[PDB]
Write a protein that holds these residues in place. Structure first.
Motif, mmCIF file in Angstrom:
data_model
loop_
_atom_site.group_PDB
_atom_site.id
_atom_site.type_symbol
_atom_site.label_atom_id
_atom_site.label_comp_id
_atom_site.label_asym_id
_atom_site.label_seq_id
_atom_site.Cartn_x
_atom_site.Cartn_y
_atom_site.Cartn_z
ATOM 1 N N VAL A 121 0.972 -1.067 0.000
ATOM 2 C CA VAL A 121 0.000 0.000 0.000
ATOM 3 C C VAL A 121 1.014 1.113 0.000
ATOM 4 C CG1 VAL A 121 -1.880 1.112 1.139
ATOM 5 C CG2 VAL A 121 -1.853 -1.308 1.004
ATOM 6 N N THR A 122 2.113 0.949 0.717
ATOM 7 C CA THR A 122 3.209 1.887 0.554
ATOM 8 C C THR A 122 4.343 1.020 0.081
ATOM 9 O OG1 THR A 122 2.464 3.053 2.532
ATOM 10 C CG2 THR A 122 4.606 3.663 1.629
ATOM 11 N N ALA A 123 4.978 1.347 -1.039
ATOM 12 C CA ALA A 123 6.145 0.599 -1.454
ATOM 13 C C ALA A 123 7.354 1.470 -1.629
ATOM 14 C CB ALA A 123 5.836 -0.070 -2.747
ATOM 15 N N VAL A 124 8.469 1.118 -1.017
ATOM 16 C CA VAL A 124 9.688 1.860 -1.269
ATOM 17 C C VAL A 124 10.791 0.960 -1.744
ATOM 18 C CG1 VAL A 124 11.577 3.021 -0.066
ATOM 19 C CG2 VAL A 124 9.229 3.832 0.212
ATOM 20 N N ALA A 125 11.456 1.292 -2.834
ATOM 21 C CA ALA A 125 12.631 0.553 -3.207
ATOM 22 C C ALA A 125 13.741 1.578 -3.227
ATOM 23 C CB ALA A 125 12.448 -0.075 -4.546
ATOM 24 N N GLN A 126 14.837 1.331 -2.543
ATOM 25 C CA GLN A 126 15.981 2.227 -2.572
ATOM 26 C C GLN A 126 17.218 1.503 -2.990
ATOM 27 O OE1 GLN A 126 18.019 3.645 1.082
ATOM 28 N NE2 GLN A 126 17.312 5.672 0.481
ATOM 29 N N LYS A 127 17.993 2.040 -3.918
ATOM 30 C CA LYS A 127 19.287 1.424 -4.214
ATOM 31 C C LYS A 127 19.183 -0.035 -4.583
ATOM 32 C CE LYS A 127 22.562 3.456 -1.321
ATOM 33 N NZ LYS A 127 23.329 4.240 -2.322
ATOM 34 N N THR A 128 18.126 -0.440 -5.265
ATOM 35 C CA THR A 128 17.870 -1.867 -5.532
ATOM 36 C C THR A 128 19.025 -2.738 -6.033
ATOM 37 O OG1 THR A 128 15.562 -1.272 -6.011
ATOM 38 C CG2 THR A 128 16.257 -3.471 -6.641
ATOM 39 N N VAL A 129 19.789 -2.294 -7.017
ATOM 40 C CA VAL A 129 20.915 -3.076 -7.486
ATOM 41 C C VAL A 129 22.165 -2.234 -7.566
ATOM 42 C CG1 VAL A 129 21.936 -4.186 -9.513
ATOM 43 C CG2 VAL A 129 19.586 -4.719 -8.906
ATOM 44 N N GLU A 130 22.782 -1.871 -6.441
ATOM 45 C CA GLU A 130 24.042 -1.141 -6.548
ATOM 46 C C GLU A 130 25.116 -1.955 -7.211
ATOM 47 O OE1 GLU A 130 24.649 1.847 -3.677
ATOM 48 O OE2 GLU A 130 24.120 0.451 -2.075
ATOM 49 N N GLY A 131 25.227 -3.210 -6.869
ATOM 50 C CA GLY A 131 26.100 -4.136 -7.562
ATOM 51 C C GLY A 131 25.550 -4.517 -8.902
ATOM 52 N N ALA A 132 26.375 -4.890 -9.844
ATOM 53 C CA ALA A 132 25.841 -5.417 -11.083
ATOM 54 C C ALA A 132 24.740 -6.484 -10.932
ATOM 55 C CB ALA A 132 26.977 -5.998 -11.865
ATOM 56 N N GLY A 133 23.562 -6.303 -11.530
ATOM 57 C CA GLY A 133 22.517 -7.314 -11.546
ATOM 58 C C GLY A 133 22.118 -7.756 -12.930
ATOM 59 N N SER A 134 22.035 -9.036 -13.220
ATOM 60 C CA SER A 134 21.543 -9.481 -14.520
ATOM 61 C C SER A 134 20.340 -10.391 -14.486
ATOM 62 C CB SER A 134 22.660 -10.193 -15.262
ATOM 63 O OG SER A 134 23.300 -11.137 -14.432
ATOM 64 N N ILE A 135 19.309 -10.120 -15.272
ATOM 65 C CA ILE A 135 18.221 -11.067 -15.367
ATOM 66 C C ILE A 135 18.106 -11.528 -16.785
ATOM 67 C CG2 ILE A 135 15.768 -11.451 -14.963
ATOM 68 C CD1 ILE A 135 16.416 -8.348 -13.581
ATOM 69 N N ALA A 136 18.083 -12.821 -17.045
ATOM 70 C CA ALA A 136 17.814 -13.293 -18.392
ATOM 71 C C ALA A 136 16.603 -14.182 -18.358
ATOM 72 C CB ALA A 136 18.998 -14.035 -18.936
ATOM 73 N N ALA A 137 15.621 -13.942 -19.197
ATOM 74 C CA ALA A 137 14.486 -14.832 -19.273
ATOM 75 C C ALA A 137 14.125 -15.356 -20.623
ATOM 76 C CB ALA A 137 13.288 -14.121 -18.709
ATOM 77 N N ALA A 138 13.884 -16.644 -20.772
ATOM 78 C CA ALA A 138 13.308 -17.092 -22.015
ATOM 79 C C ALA A 138 11.993 -17.618 -21.509
ATOM 80 C CB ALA A 138 14.118 -18.177 -22.647
ATOM 81 N N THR A 139 10.891 -17.183 -22.073
ATOM 82 C CA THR A 139 9.601 -17.616 -21.599
ATOM 83 C C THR A 139 8.780 -18.014 -22.810
ATOM 84 O OG1 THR A 139 9.812 -15.883 -19.911
ATOM 85 C CG2 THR A 139 7.734 -17.057 -20.012
ATOM 86 N N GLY A 140 8.203 -19.201 -22.825
ATOM 87 C CA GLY A 140 7.431 -19.560 -23.980
ATOM 88 C C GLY A 140 7.257 -21.006 -24.265
ATOM 89 N N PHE A 141 6.599 -21.293 -25.367
ATOM 90 C CA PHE A 141 6.431 -22.673 -25.755
ATOM 91 C C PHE A 141 6.777 -22.986 -27.198
ATOM 92 C CE2 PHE A 141 2.255 -20.807 -26.411
ATOM 93 C CZ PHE A 141 1.859 -21.354 -27.612
ATOM 94 N N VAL A 142 7.254 -24.194 -27.446
ATOM 95 C CA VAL A 142 7.525 -24.606 -28.805
ATOM 96 C C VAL A 142 6.593 -25.755 -29.091
ATOM 97 C CG1 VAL A 142 9.296 -25.205 -30.470
ATOM 98 C CG2 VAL A 142 9.941 -24.109 -28.322
ATOM 99 N N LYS A 143 5.882 -25.724 -30.206
ATOM 100 C CA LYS A 143 5.011 -26.830 -30.575
ATOM 101 C C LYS A 143 5.365 -27.358 -31.954
ATOM 102 C CE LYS A 143 0.633 -26.288 -28.130
ATOM 103 N NZ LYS A 143 -0.692 -25.616 -28.155
#
Lengths: 73, 73, 73, 73, 73
Positions: free
Chosen positions: A51-73
Motif C-alpha cells: 500500500v506503501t512501497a519503497v525501493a531504494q538502491k535496488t541493485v548497486e552491484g551489477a545485476g543481470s536477469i535473463a528470461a526465455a519464456t514460452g512454448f515450442v510446438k
C-alpha cells in the motif's frame, strides 16, 4: 538463457518511512488461470508491492536477469 | 537470451516517505487468463507498485535484462 | 539456464519504518489455477509484498537470475 | 540449470521497524490448483511478505538463481 | 541442476522490531490441490512471511539456488 553479474571493488542509503492504512489488500505477484489451456509466466527481478512501497538502491552491484519464456510446438 | 552486468570500482541516497491511506488495494504484477489458450508473459526488472510507490537509485550498478518471450509453432 | 554471480572485494544502509494498519490482507506470490490444463510459472529474484513494503539495497553484491520457463510439445 | 555464486574478500545496515495491526492475514507463497491438470511452479530467491515487509541488504554477497520450469511432451 | 556457492575471506547489522497485532493468520509457503491431477512445485531461497516480516542481510555470503521444476511425458 545465461545471466552473469560481476562486481569488483554523512548519511548514505538511509530511508525513513511512516505508513498508516486503515485497510490494506496487496496481491504481490499473481498468476491466475481459469478455464485456460496453456499459461506460461515468468517474473524476474525485484518486485516491491505495497500500500506503501519503497525501493531504494535496488541493485548497486551489477545485476543481470535473463528470461526465455514460452512454448515450442 | 544472455544478460551480462559488470561493475568495477552530506546526505547521499536518502529518502523520507510518509503515507496515510484509509483504504488500499494494490495488484503488483498480475497475469490473468480466463478461457484462454496460450498466454506467455515475462516481467523483468524492477516493478514497484504502491498506493504510494517510491523507487530511488534503482540500478546504480550496471543492470542488464534480456528477455525472449514467445512461441514457435 | 545458467546464472553466475561474482563479487570480489555516518549512517550507511539504515532504514526506519513505522506502520499502523487496522486491517491487512497480503498475498505474496500466488499462482492459482481453476479448471486449467497447463500452467507453468516461475518467480525469481526478490519480491517484497506488504501493506507497507520496503526494499533497501537489495543486491549490493552482484546478483544473477536466469529463467527458462515453458513447455515443448 | 546451474547457478554459481562467488564472494572473495557509524551505523551500517541497521533497521528499526515498529508495526501495529489490528488484523493481519498474510499468504506468503501459495500455489493453488482446483480441477487442474498440470501446474508447474517455481519460486526462487527471497520473498518477503508482510502486513509490514522490510527487506534490507538482501544479497550483499553474490547471489545466483537459475530456474528451468516447465514440461516436455 | 547444480548450485555452487563459494565464500573466501559502530553498529553493523542491527535490527529492532516491535510488533503488536490483535489477530494474525499467516500461511507461509502453501501448495494446495483440490481435484488436481499433476502439481509440481518448488520453493527455493528464503521466504519470510509475517504479519510483520523483516529480512536483513539475507545472503551476505555467496548464495546459489538452482531449480529444475517440471514434468516430461
Amino acid at each position: 538463457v545465461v545471466a552473469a553479474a560481476e562486481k569488483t571493488k554523512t548519511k548514505e542509503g538511509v530511508l525513513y518511512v511512516g505508513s498508516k492504512t486503515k485497510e490494506g489488500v496487496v496481491h504481490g505477484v499473481a498468476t491466475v488461470a481459469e478455464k485456460t489451456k496453456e499459461q506460461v509466466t515468468n517474473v524476474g527481478g525485484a518486485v516491491v508491492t505495497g500500500v506503501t512501497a519503497v525501493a531504494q538502491k535496488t541493485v548497486e552491484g551489477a545485476g543481470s536477469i535473463a528470461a526465455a519464456t514460452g512454448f515450442v510446438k
